[PDB]
Amino acid sequence: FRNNYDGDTVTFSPTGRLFQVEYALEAIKQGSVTVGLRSNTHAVLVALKRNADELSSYQKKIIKCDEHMGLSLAGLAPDARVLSNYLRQQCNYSSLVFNRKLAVERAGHLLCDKAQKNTQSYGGRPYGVGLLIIGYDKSGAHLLEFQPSGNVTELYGTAIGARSQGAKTYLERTLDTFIKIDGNPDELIKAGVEAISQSLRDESLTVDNLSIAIVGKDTPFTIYDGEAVAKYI
Amino acid sequence: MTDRYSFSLTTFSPSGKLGQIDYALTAVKQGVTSLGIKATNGVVIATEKKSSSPLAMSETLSKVSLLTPDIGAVYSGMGPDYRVLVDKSRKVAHTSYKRIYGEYPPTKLLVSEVAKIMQEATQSGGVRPFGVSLLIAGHDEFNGFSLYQVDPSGSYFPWKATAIGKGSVAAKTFLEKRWNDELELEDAIHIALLTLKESVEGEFNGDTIELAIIGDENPDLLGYTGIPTDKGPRFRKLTSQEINDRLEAL
Amino acid sequence: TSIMAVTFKDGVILGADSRTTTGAYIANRVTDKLTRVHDKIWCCRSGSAADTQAIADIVQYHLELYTSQYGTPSTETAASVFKELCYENKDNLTAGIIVAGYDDKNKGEVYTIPLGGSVHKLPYAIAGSGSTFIYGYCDKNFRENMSKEETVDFIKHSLSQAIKWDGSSGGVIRMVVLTAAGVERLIFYPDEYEQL
Amino acid sequence: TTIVGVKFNNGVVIAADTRSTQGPIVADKNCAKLHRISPKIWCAGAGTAADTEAVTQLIGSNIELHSLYTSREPRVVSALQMLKQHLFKYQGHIGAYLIVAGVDPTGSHLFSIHAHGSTDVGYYLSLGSGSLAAMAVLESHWKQDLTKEEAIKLASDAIQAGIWNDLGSGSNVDVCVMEIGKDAEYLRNYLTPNVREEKQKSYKFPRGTTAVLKESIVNICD
Amino acid sequence: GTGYDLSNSVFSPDGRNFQVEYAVKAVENGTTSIGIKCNDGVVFAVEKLITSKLLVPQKNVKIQVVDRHIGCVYSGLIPDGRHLVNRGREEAASFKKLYKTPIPIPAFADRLGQYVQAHTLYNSVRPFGVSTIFGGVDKNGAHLYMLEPSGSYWGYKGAATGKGRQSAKAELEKLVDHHPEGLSAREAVKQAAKIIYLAHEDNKEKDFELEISWCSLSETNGLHKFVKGDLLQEAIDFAQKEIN
Amino acid sequence: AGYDRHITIFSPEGRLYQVEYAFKATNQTNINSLAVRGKDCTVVISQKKVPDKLLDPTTVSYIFCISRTIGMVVNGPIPDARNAALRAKAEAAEFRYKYGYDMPCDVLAKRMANLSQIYTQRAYMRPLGVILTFVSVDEELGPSIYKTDPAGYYVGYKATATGPKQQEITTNLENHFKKSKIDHINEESWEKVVEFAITHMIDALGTEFSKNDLEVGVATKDKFFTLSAENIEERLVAIAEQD
Amino acid sequence: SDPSSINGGIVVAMTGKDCVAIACDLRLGSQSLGVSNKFEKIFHYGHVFLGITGLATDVTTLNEMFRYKTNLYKLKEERAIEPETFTQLVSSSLYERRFGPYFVGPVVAGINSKSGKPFIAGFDLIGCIDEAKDFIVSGTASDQLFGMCESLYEPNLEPEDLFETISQALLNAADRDALSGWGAVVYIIKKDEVVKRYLKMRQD
Amino acid sequence: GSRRYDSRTTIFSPEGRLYQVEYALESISHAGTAIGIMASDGIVLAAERKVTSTLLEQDTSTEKLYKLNDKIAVAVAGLTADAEILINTARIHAQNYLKTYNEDIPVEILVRRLSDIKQGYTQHGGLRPFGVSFIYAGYDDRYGYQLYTSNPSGNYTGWKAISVGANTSAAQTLLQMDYKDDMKVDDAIELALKTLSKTTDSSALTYDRLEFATIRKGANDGEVYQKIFKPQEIKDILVKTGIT
Ligand SMILES: CC(C)C[C@H](NC(=O)[C@H](Cc1ccccc1)NC(=O)c1cnccn1)B(O)O
Ligand SMILES: CC(C)C[C@H](NC(=O)[C@H](Cc1ccccc1)NC(=O)c1cnccn1)B(O)O
């Protein structure tokens, strides 16, 4: 069975599965946990950064795409660099040609279509990364989940990576509370840090261990690391 | 999309055989017998019209094709493979010869071109060799009358007489007994008809048998008059009636 | 050249002179400038003989391919194909073309395509070197919903005036009648139209 | 150059003069302006000599391949279409001006093609610098329903108009007759009304007249 | 031997293309979607499985418009469907550009068809992992189509695909029999809502969300529009009541 | 070794399995068709089977109008059929543009057989699992039937039949032509020739047809067209007033 | 400006009784300045002779090109190219450069080895074939050559007579052309032998 | 995809040999033997025609000996069709050289080029190599008479005497024994015929089973002549040497 049908992305299994895509999905699960959630005014990303040694840096998980849009990554970091870069260009093209900030929904559809092309052609490979995209556009705050299969979903909240199921159940439980946490950035982040701590096991979330991002109403997408995340530990 | 078969499909096996060329020749062996005989004043090529239905009109499928006014072809093996080789042979006779010296190529050179097209199918990426052997007969001013065999490998050899396909070994033997260097064209047509009767199972008449010659110029077949140096093609397909006439003196 | 197409009650008529010139020499005096691109879609050609023919041949090809896949094309679709060729190749073409067609749902329709490759849908249209001379006459004499006989007469008189003044126009007046009935070829010789 | 084409009741006839010029100079007193596209489609050419020979041979070749491919006799409308589309592609730069005529399985045909790629149909046509002399004759003597013989006369007369009145034309008359049921007949130097009169003197030199400096045998063999 | 099912363009000894048949499996594994043709238009509806409370309601739109007059819905690999619709949109733009008129639905059907069939001609590509239900109104009425991973498509009175295709097909067949005189736009919408609720039983474990769109000559002028608010809620009720 | 059965290269026996399996695919649809020549027409009959009640019967067809004069019936899966139909249309339109006359039936046939031959030789292309029957009244050869298969083979027919029950029809027709001694049906009108074809479809298959079980294409001088359900019924009524 | 008038140069060919003759001048100039008096414009491939007038660089190039093609021809055909055939090879080779032509006036002379029939032909720069039965002329003194030939020539001359004729035709045409002369060479081609003679002429 | 069916014609074996070259060489070893012998006043090429029949026209035939130049010729062992592809490019290269420098191509330059073309098929492009071995016989004004050999690897070497094709080892041993540097062409002719006569896998060595050629400075010229022996000429010279 499986061994005969997982050679490349161009091959269907007898049950209609695409194993190379499923294998790409496994790189996400092995990635460090990251969380996203939003109110009607703001959207927040929280990520647990991973290090190699205690002598190593913690590898960055949050990339900015435009002044109103950015993302967190779980999986193969280079693939996130390629995809965030493409998104950066699309965000950019919309501004130059149309003097228009790209709709987060529209960015969603673009990433879906780009990933898809690599799931149907020979010699290509699926992307091995999951992405959480937050933004503030003409219809307010937004959060998106991107899967290397091409599936993009709009959500109030979610988490991806190792042990991500913890935070996901927390957010599902908290839903009615955080959706209302309007006009107060520090409280939405607090709910996000509380979500991400439901996925801790190994160690605690430290000062150079945390990464948080925020966008909204009158707040351009900004990255917080180190000392600047201290008031959330 | 895009042909990503940029590698040879014919390669050498440890014994040194080229598998696909062998297998193509095997396909040729299953094909209906065809033959050629070279007389002093002409060449004859013949084969059997092995119709695939009595509902089919066997005239709509010619196995003997004109390549230039002085050159004709016949084959044994895969019919469709032959058809496209005829299209290509006819074209290359123009692009590589007529459009350059204002005359049609001599037989050996047109053969040489066909052979190259077949050699390439043996080496290029993503193709299989042609599943045919051809017999090409023709005339030219400086070489006179001449018969050639072309095989799936792209090799060709000149013949006094030969046969290919199904009953070739028997027919080749029958030609070795009957051939001499003093044969008039009519005599050769006679030998051809005898040789082919051993191969044909069913009916043996001008409707079943397809036969063509390279003989004298046919000014009646030219279509126009007024240029002395255009004296008419030497290639002539014999009619059903012309065959039956010679089957009564058989 | 003098060419026109007129919509009336039953359909549409196409008219043309028969003169092609190289300078002041009449290279052809019996030219057919009324060209068929489909059973009931025709065009009037003016400008370069080579350009208009090559354009007309391309359109006929496209519409035949259209019919094989989709069924009878609308006159508007025919005009669109013409336009696309004339517009996209405006720098290397000298083609002034009138498209007229009969359709059962739109009766008779006329589309004019002048030099730059713009499209204009009109009740009637005139074009060619000779047309300049009948802008006044045609504007004063055209009515909507005329009868066949009336329309034949309008084109006949109009083109004879154009033929009279324009050296690039002349020969015979040709017409093509497009209705539900059918396609009818009309021809009128100098001895008739000159004395109108 | 003067080339004409004339339809008759059962076919078509074409004819041409035999003069070629560069500036005021007659380069060729007897070139052949009649070309065979296929055995029953012939072509009269005017303009640039290399160009009419080339365009005629190219389409001839391709027509031949089409015929073999389709098992059909070539049609005049095919040669017409292929020539016009070729000339059109070269915007005029290929200086071929052609009267194309022939018989095929749809009847008899007569067309003209100009260098930019426009085609015309007529019962009678002429092209070349002699075009106006010849057309004047055609416009004067043509009628519908000509016999083969009346057509040859009409065509041949048209070229004579060109030969005598146009400095661009001269020497001889070539004709080709294409009749619906028959083989095309090509009739090279049908008229030769311009035979040079006998010279007044022979200019044959006494041997040794020319001074030679040096001599040697040339090797032709290998 | 075997291995006939490992490469896309390969014929098995019985003349089948197993890779396509395998694509069909991914389709059968998908959400159920449907189309109903009515007296002057077409209605599309689909089941959206609510994986979580966290999925923002009404947001993750599945029905897709092509040009102004064509609706498309599909079951199977969602991205594969978007790819097909992307192509359909290019396919239609090209047609409108040259011919000025908007693309007829039969014409558009073949555009998709030929494209999908192209992905069964080479081993360097994979067949499409969706069946697509699409249609609209043109010069001569309403048209409804369904297109399979093989590139096969036909016109349909009613059509269904995905998990609950059998329930839906059974429900569709009854309508054809109890209404030979031709359904109306408004009725076909209520009916659409019902049919999805009834194929939802084949997956009754996970909640779901209803999505409906329509293209009717009298109701939408010919244009493809989404069913929203009052008309959606009215359709939901009719189905919620006919489930009991 | 075992890959000689996956792409179109020779087997040790000199055979092309992928071509052979393509021939197998042609019968997937379980539909039979036949073609006969009249005095000045050509008729194609093909079974029409609409199993699902949900289908729009008017869109279920294996007959195609290639050009104003050429019709083509296909035995094989629809997506491959339509692929071949699209190509033939395009090839027919292009021929007319380039050569200034309508593409003959046999010439288009040769052209499609050539494309099919190519899939037989080049590895990256699969054969189309279809058989194509082309029909017209050729302006030179008169009524015409030419048929092409996935082997790239093609020939002209007096009459022909294609599908699972091909042989039944073939032998039926073969017997008629031994009897009649001529190479067409002696009938002046296309209406009677359609009737003859339906009659012999009934005898050879041993099945009766309603107006919705058949599909008919007729080719006359300068048109090829297909009959409506009601045009068929008129043909079915006429045969019954005799049996 | 005119690439046909930079280097200067004439070639002329005539038919006789079972013979042909081809002649050229020897000048290679650069406008008014004479550069070389040894520049031969006649070449031969087997028994087929070719003279080229015009732009010297193209004269040289075309010779090297025909040597190349006739060598290949002979290898494949296993026979020497014939005058008729070569004429066709020249034509198609020139027309191949239709819109970027070689600035030359080629001239072919020879006797068919199979038929004994004398053959000459001339070409324009784009390959149009002029196949005269009497004489062909080419170069910056072609007007003068046409005049000399049209008077001096008569049919069926014997090799020794034809020699005298063609030499006078060339010499007297050259002396009325500023860009032709500086020596002259004449080939008398018979089936069997080919004789080559350098003429004495004015060196100004 | 395609990768499945790729034989990978240009990889190394674990032992560092090229599979396809070796198998091509194996094919060459079954081909009619060809012999080249250089003398002081000329060169000899001889070759055994593999498989013959009464009906094979030998007068029109050529399968082993090809003229490349007026001064260079080759003997072929292997696939004739493959050889012709190579022979034709070799003729072109010679003419390109002649046009560039106005000198006939030195023998090695041509040989190196042909050998380079063969080498390429060994390192890139995923095609099978040419199943050909060449013996080159030529003269030039730098080195005089030369004899070279190239095979499917694209390696080439120079020899006083050599053989290719079948039974080379036996033939090489025989040439090593009887060859002497002071040899004349006429003695070389005899050596080549003896050697072939002693290694045929046929009963006896008749004229109809041979092709013969000499490159001589034929002393009366003070220029080099390629003589391709006609069938009668072989029959004569076979009698003189004493084989009848
Ligand atoms: C459409 C064509 C056939 C009719 C007339 N065109 C020509 O006669 C044109 C010149 C012209 C004259 C007046 C205004 C514009 C262009 N003539 C040609 O195209 C022409 C003439 N001789 C040979 C080939 N083509 B016209 O539009 O006045
Ligand atoms: C078509 C040919 C055969 C007939 C006549 N043409 C010529 O004589 C043309 C006149 C011409 C045309 C364009 C540019 C320069 C010169 N002459 C030549 O083509 C020509 C050919 N070879 C040598 C010298 N001149 B004509 O149409 O008056």
Tab-separated table of N, CA, C and O in Angstrom, chain B residues 8-13 17-27 121-122 127-131 152-153, chain F residues 1 3-4 7-12 14-16 120-121:
chain	number	residue	atom	x	y	z
B	8	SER	N	16.743	8.326	-24.042
B	8	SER	CA	16.563	7.212	-24.976
B	8	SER	C	15.627	6.152	-24.406
B	8	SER	O	15.672	5.850	-23.210
B	9	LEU	N	14.771	5.601	-25.261
B	9	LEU	CA	13.937	4.470	-24.876
B	9	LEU	C	14.518	3.175	-25.439
B	9	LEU	O	14.123	2.084	-25.023
B	10	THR	N	15.447	3.315	-26.387
B	10	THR	CA	16.238	2.197	-26.896
B	10	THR	C	17.644	2.303	-26.318
B	10	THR	O	18.354	3.286	-26.557
B	11	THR	N	18.037	1.303	-25.537
B	11	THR	CA	19.383	1.265	-24.967
B	11	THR	C	20.011	-0.108	-25.191
B	11	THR	O	19.316	-1.060	-25.561
B	12	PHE	N	21.319	-0.208	-24.975
B	12	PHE	CA	22.020	-1.482	-25.120
B	12	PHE	C	21.815	-2.370	-23.895
B	12	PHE	O	21.902	-1.899	-22.759
B	13	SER	N	21.538	-3.650	-24.134
B	13	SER	CA	21.480	-4.642	-23.061
B	13	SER	C	22.874	-5.261	-22.895
B	13	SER	O	23.704	-5.128	-23.790
B	17	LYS	N	22.590	-6.188	-27.470
B	17	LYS	CA	21.414	-6.057	-28.328
B	17	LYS	C	20.751	-4.700	-28.083
B	17	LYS	O	20.824	-4.147	-26.976
B	18	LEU	N	20.117	-4.162	-29.117
B	18	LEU	CA	19.235	-3.020	-28.937
B	18	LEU	C	17.807	-3.559	-28.981
B	18	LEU	O	17.265	-3.814	-30.067
B	19	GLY	N	17.226	-3.739	-27.791
B	19	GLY	CA	15.952	-4.442	-27.602
B	19	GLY	C	14.809	-4.009	-28.501
B	19	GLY	O	14.201	-4.836	-29.189
B	20	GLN	N	14.530	-2.709	-28.509
B	20	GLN	CA	13.405	-2.170	-29.263
B	20	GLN	C	13.519	-2.386	-30.771
B	20	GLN	O	12.512	-2.619	-31.443
B	21	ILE	N	14.740	-2.323	-31.294
B	21	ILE	CA	14.992	-2.586	-32.713
B	21	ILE	C	14.699	-4.047	-33.060
B	21	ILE	O	14.076	-4.331	-34.090
B	22	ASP	N	15.151	-4.966	-32.200
B	22	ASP	CA	14.806	-6.381	-32.339
B	22	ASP	C	13.294	-6.560	-32.334
B	22	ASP	O	12.742	-7.199	-33.230
B	23	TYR	N	12.628	-5.981	-31.335
B	23	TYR	CA	11.181	-6.124	-31.197
B	23	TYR	C	10.429	-5.532	-32.389
B	23	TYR	O	9.423	-6.092	-32.840
B	24	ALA	N	10.931	-4.416	-32.911
B	24	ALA	CA	10.365	-3.837	-34.122
B	24	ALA	C	10.490	-4.810	-35.301
B	24	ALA	O	9.512	-5.047	-36.010
B	25	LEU	N	11.684	-5.382	-35.495
B	25	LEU	CA	11.904	-6.373	-36.554
B	25	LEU	C	10.956	-7.565	-36.409
B	25	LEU	O	10.485	-8.107	-37.413
B	26	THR	N	10.686	-7.959	-35.158
B	26	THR	CA	9.695	-8.994	-34.857
B	26	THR	C	8.309	-8.578	-35.363
B	26	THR	O	7.611	-9.382	-35.987
B	27	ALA	N	7.924	-7.324	-35.112
B	27	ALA	CA	6.673	-6.784	-35.653
B	27	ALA	C	6.657	-6.856	-37.180
B	27	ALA	O	5.627	-7.181	-37.769
B	121	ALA	N	14.739	7.648	-34.649
B	121	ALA	CA	13.700	7.060	-33.793
B	121	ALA	C	14.279	5.980	-32.870
B	121	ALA	O	13.605	5.460	-31.979
B	122	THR	N	15.550	5.675	-33.097
B	122	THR	CA	16.290	4.627	-32.413
B	122	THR	C	17.136	5.226	-31.286
B	122	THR	O	17.576	4.511	-30.382
B	127	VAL	N	10.924	8.310	-27.893
B	127	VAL	CA	10.298	7.639	-29.030
B	127	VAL	C	10.642	6.148	-29.080
B	127	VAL	O	11.583	5.698	-28.427
B	128	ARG	N	9.866	5.395	-29.854
B	128	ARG	CA	10.161	3.998	-30.155
B	128	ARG	C	10.575	3.925	-31.617
B	128	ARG	O	10.156	4.774	-32.417
B	129	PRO	N	11.398	2.923	-31.985
B	129	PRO	CA	11.727	2.742	-33.403
B	129	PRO	C	10.467	2.543	-34.232
B	129	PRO	O	9.422	2.193	-33.684
B	130	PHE	N	10.557	2.790	-35.533
B	130	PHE	CA	9.453	2.487	-36.442
B	130	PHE	C	9.313	0.978	-36.564
B	130	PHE	O	10.310	0.273	-36.717
B	131	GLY	N	8.078	0.489	-36.501
B	131	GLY	CA	7.807	-0.934	-36.654
B	131	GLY	C	7.631	-1.363	-38.095
B	131	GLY	O	6.684	-2.081	-38.405
B	152	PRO	N	14.167	-1.137	-39.356
B	152	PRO	CA	13.890	-0.309	-38.188
B	152	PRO	C	15.117	0.355	-37.567
B	152	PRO	O	14.992	1.434	-36.981
B	153	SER	N	16.284	-0.268	-37.699
B	153	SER	CA	17.529	0.301	-37.160
B	153	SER	C	17.971	1.538	-37.937
B	153	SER	O	18.694	2.384	-37.404
F	1	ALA	N	11.833	-4.000	-17.692
F	1	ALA	CA	11.182	-5.151	-18.389
F	1	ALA	C	9.653	-4.985	-18.473
F	1	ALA	O	9.109	-4.826	-19.578
F	3	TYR	N	7.659	-2.597	-17.928
F	3	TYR	CA	7.173	-1.284	-18.332
F	3	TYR	C	6.770	-1.225	-19.806
F	3	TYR	O	6.217	-0.222	-20.263
F	4	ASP	N	7.032	-2.304	-20.541
F	4	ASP	CA	6.582	-2.421	-21.930
F	4	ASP	C	5.053	-2.483	-22.030
F	4	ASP	O	4.494	-2.593	-23.123
F	7	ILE	N	3.911	2.368	-21.141
F	7	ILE	CA	4.049	3.354	-22.214
F	7	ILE	C	4.178	2.641	-23.554
F	7	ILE	O	4.370	1.429	-23.603
F	8	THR	N	4.063	3.394	-24.637
F	8	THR	CA	3.992	2.791	-25.957
F	8	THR	C	5.355	2.441	-26.553
F	8	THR	O	5.731	2.974	-27.593
F	9	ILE	N	6.095	1.552	-25.890
F	9	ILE	CA	7.250	0.907	-26.527
F	9	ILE	C	6.948	-0.578	-26.789
F	9	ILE	O	6.059	-1.154	-26.156
F	10	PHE	N	7.671	-1.177	-27.739
F	10	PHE	CA	7.431	-2.562	-28.150
F	10	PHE	C	7.612	-3.573	-27.021
F	10	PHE	O	8.480	-3.406	-26.163
F	11	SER	N	6.780	-4.611	-27.030
F	11	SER	CA	6.978	-5.783	-26.192
F	11	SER	C	7.868	-6.753	-26.967
F	11	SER	O	8.003	-6.609	-28.185
F	12	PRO	N	8.469	-7.753	-26.284
F	12	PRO	CA	9.279	-8.734	-27.027
F	12	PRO	C	8.556	-9.375	-28.228
F	12	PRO	O	9.212	-9.813	-29.167
F	14	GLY	N	6.708	-7.703	-30.242
F	14	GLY	CA	6.559	-6.647	-31.251
F	14	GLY	C	5.201	-5.968	-31.205
F	14	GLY	O	4.720	-5.449	-32.208
F	15	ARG	N	4.594	-5.963	-30.022
F	15	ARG	CA	3.241	-5.478	-29.838
F	15	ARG	C	3.229	-4.224	-28.973
F	15	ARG	O	4.187	-3.957	-28.237
F	16	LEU	N	2.138	-3.465	-29.060
F	16	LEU	CA	1.981	-2.263	-28.255
F	16	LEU	C	0.747	-2.354	-27.361
F	16	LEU	O	-0.359	-1.969	-27.756
F	120	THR	N	1.134	6.691	-30.543
F	120	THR	CA	1.606	5.333	-30.678
F	120	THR	C	3.138	5.242	-30.649
F	120	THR	O	3.700	4.174	-30.358
F	121	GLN	N	3.807	6.363	-30.931
F	121	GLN	CA	5.262	6.374	-31.054
F	121	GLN	C	5.957	7.180	-29.959
F	121	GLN	O	7.040	6.799	-29.493
